[PDB]
Paper text:
[name], the most frequently mutated oncogene in human cancer, produces two isoforms, [name] and [name], through alternative splicing. These isoforms differ in exon 4, which encodes the final 15 residues of the G-domain and hypervariable regions (HVRs), vital for trafficking and membrane localization. RAS proteins act as binary switches, transitioning between the active [guanosine triphosphate (GTP)–bound] and inactive [guanosine diphosphate (GDP)–bound] forms. We present the structures of both the active and inactive forms of [name], as well as of the complex between [name] and the primary effector protein [name] and compare them to previously reported [name] structures.
To gain insights into the interaction between [name] with its downstream effector [name] kinase, we solved the structures of [name] bound to the RAS-binding domain ([name]) of [name] at 1.65-Å resolution and bound to the [name] and cysteine-rich domain ([name]-CRD) at 2.65-Å resolution. Figure 7A shows the superposition of the two complexes aligned using only the [name] components. Strand β2 of the [name] contacts the N-terminal section of strand β2 of [name] to create an extended β sheet bridging the two proteins, whereas the [name] CRD interacts with [name] residues located on the interswitch region and helix α5. The β strands that form the intermolecular β sheet align well structurally, but the loops and helices of the [name] show noticeable positional heterogeneity, reflecting the flexibility of the molecule away from the β sheet that anchors it to RAS.
Author numbering:
A (entry chain A): 1 to 170
B (entry chain B): 56 to 72, 75 to 102, 109 to 131
Write the structure that this text describes.
Amino acid sequence: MTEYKLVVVGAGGVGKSALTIQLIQNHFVDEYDPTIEDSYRKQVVIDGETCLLDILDTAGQEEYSAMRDQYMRTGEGFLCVFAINNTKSFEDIHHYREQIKRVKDSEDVPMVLVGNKCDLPSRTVDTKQAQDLARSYGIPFIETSAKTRQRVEDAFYTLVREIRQYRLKK
Amino acid sequence: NTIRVFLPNKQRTVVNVGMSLHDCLMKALKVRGLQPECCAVFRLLKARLDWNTDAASLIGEELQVDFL
Ligand SMILES: Nc1nc2c(ncn2[C@@H]2O[C@H](COP(=O)(O)OP(=O)(O)NP(=O)(O)O)[C@@H](O)[C@H]2O)c(=O)[nH]1
Ligand SMILES: [Mg+2]
């Protein structure tokens, strides 16, 4: 069975864990529980095909950043998450992507840009600005809400499809 | 004050620690669809630990949760 090693990255509090838990099961955590490191495994069907996802949910708090080199070397695709009401988390995306490429010594790393918390009326990052950033990166952009489950599966499955194509580019 | 815990089905978590092992691993098991009453927790270098063990007493060691 085909396997995909997904890694969820982004600043603290953007919703990485909430998104991951929503994918694994239908449940929205509404509490403060910062991640150190958590790995999840789930069998899914994508485009009619059964796949096994290994999802690494990483720490946004910089005190744990020493772990990044290792999980960036091992990960096959990266879900790069910011919150649409947190401009700083959007600015942090650039350096996560740059560090991933630095660690993997490659300009072609499967990635998806994710703007989370789209259920909020208070927005500071326009959809159009984030779409344009993704356009220039050459990667997909998806706006999600872990609270409402809007486009959560789409985000992870789009990342899988990016990896699936990258493997065939060989 | 962290403990690395290997979980069933090739999963893992790192927990920050004074509460027992059950209380501090309850959430990690629940979001993965695991009932603590169906699992045992072990200290590596395997010896079974009581779920009510103080997690503070295990800081620095690696634990493993396996289906019973
Ligand atoms: N309104 C709203 N709140 C959300 C959403 N996703 C997460 N949250 C809230 O945002 C806070 C942070 O969520 P969490 O998933 O723990 O964020 P994180 O990115 O994993 N943080 P860390 O990097 O420290 O582990 C929590 O209060 C969570 O309830 C969302 O889509 N909408
Ligand atoms: Mg988290």
